[PDB]
């Protein structure tokens, strides 16, 4: 899978740094009452749709792991590494096609998003606990909605640009 490429190996690092930075920084207050920290998943999904593609799973996983360390709940680090790490890959591998059109991105985003929703739900419902799973479902559903929406909003303009 990994080679790794000359420029791409650095691009992944920078994008991870960006996602983590945005994760710690940017807060998105929902209309009562939680927040949307996983706008980093915008960076994840976008990194998966841009070039992307399979390799974007690094930008998904390592970043989320670091987020778990920094935000932070270090105990969940492996879980997030797996959930996000596979999430970005589910978006990436399912994406092409040839990036043509919005729907072409709309379909794989739905599947990859469920990996987070179902993943964290099972992650919660393990140490926990019947209500924690439901709460995780709701929160991560709103969060997935925001992330996918923003990603869809950006990825258009970006594909026209983008180095490689």
């Amino acid at each position: 899978m990994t080679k790794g490429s000359l420029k791409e190996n650095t691009i992944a690092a920078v994008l991870i740094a960006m996602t983590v930075a945005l994760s710690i920084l940017v807060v998105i207050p929902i209309p009562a009452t939680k927040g949307i920290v996983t706008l980093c998943e915008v960076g994840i999904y976008t990194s998966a749709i841009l070039y992307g593609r399979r390799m974007g799973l690094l930008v998904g996983g390592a970043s989320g792991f670091l987020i778990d360390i920094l935000t932070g709940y270090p105990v969940w680090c492996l879980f997030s590494l797996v959930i996000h790490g596979t999430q970005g890959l589910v978006v990436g591998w399912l994406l092409p096609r040839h990036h043509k059109g919005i729907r072409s991105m709309l379909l794989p985003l739905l599947v990859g998003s469920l990996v987070m929703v179902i993943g964290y739900c099972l992650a919660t419902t393990l140490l926990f606990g019947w209500p924690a799973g439901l709460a995780s479902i709701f929160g991560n559903v709103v969060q997935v909605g925001f992330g996918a929406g923003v990603t869809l909003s950006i990825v258009g303009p970006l594909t026209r640009l983008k180095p490689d």
Partner: protein
């Protein structure tokens, strides 16, 4: 209170499964003895602890109260007792919340964010045998980690710049808010691309060339063997 700190990452790795791989009442006595012992050993000063439990307090209340109310028997509208199982289970999940949250805070305050990447590089060593590149992930993770703070300084200045020219960040609802995130996200991505391209030509021209290989610039075994003994003691009783 710093230590190895390479083993703390393994603590973060194992504490998750160790947490639920134990019923009772007895393994809880072992677990609490271990955790409280670690807390007392590592200073604290419960301020950051209680302030750490503070945001998740709503989730603790929600989970415990739902685990209760959906158990005495609650469903089909009837309370009283029989329920006690749900009571002690709610207590179990409450103490569970306390343990996981406080240990999360302790682990957060323990390690300095720097050496964690090198620790990851050290722990990924066996993975070398599985053909998985270790040094590439190590360099990538180190560069990313060191670029995390400087990208925060960048993300703030971009937001301030856009706010200065009319962009109203943070305001509701959600669609109009997500549309507002674009003038922040788009510049950052393109800046990240330039950040990498300049870094690629930098590393290429630098003394480090195209390598990927190969060069790298007593309390350890104690607490981990203690962790092993405690973990075995937990493995003894577990009701299954």
């Amino acid at each position: 209170h710093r230590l190895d700190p390479r083993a703390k990452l393994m603590l973060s790795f194992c504490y998750i499964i160790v947490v639920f791989l134990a019923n009772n009442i007895w393994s809880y006595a072992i677990l609490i003895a271990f955790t409280v012992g670690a807390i007392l050993s590592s200073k604290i000063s419960l301020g950051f602890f209680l302030k750490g439990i503070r945001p998740l307090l709503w989730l603790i209340v929600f989970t415990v109260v739902l685990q209760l109310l959906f158990s005495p028997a609650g469903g089909h509208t009837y309370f009283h007792w029989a329920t006690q199982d749900g009571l002690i289970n709610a207590g179990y999940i409450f103490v569970r919340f306390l343990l996981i949250i406080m240990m999360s805070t302790l682990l957060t305050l323990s390690t300095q964010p720097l050496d964690i990447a090198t620790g990851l590089a050290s722990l990924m060593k066996p993975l070398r045998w599985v053909k998985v590149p270790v040094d590439t992930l190590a360099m990538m993770l180190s560069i990313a980690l060191r670029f995390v703070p400087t990208l925060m300084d960048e993300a703030t200045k971009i937001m301030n710049a856009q706010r200065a020219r009319g962009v109203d960040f943070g305001e509701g609802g959600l669609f109009k808010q997500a549309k507002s995130l674009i003038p922040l996200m788009v510049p950052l991505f393109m800046s990240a691309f330039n950040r990498a391209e300049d870094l690629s030509t930098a590393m290429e021209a630098r003394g480090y060339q195209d390598s990927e290989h190969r060069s790298q610039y007593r309390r350890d075994t104690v607490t981990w063997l203690l962790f092993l003994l405690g973990f075995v003691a937990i493995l003894i009783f577990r009701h299954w």
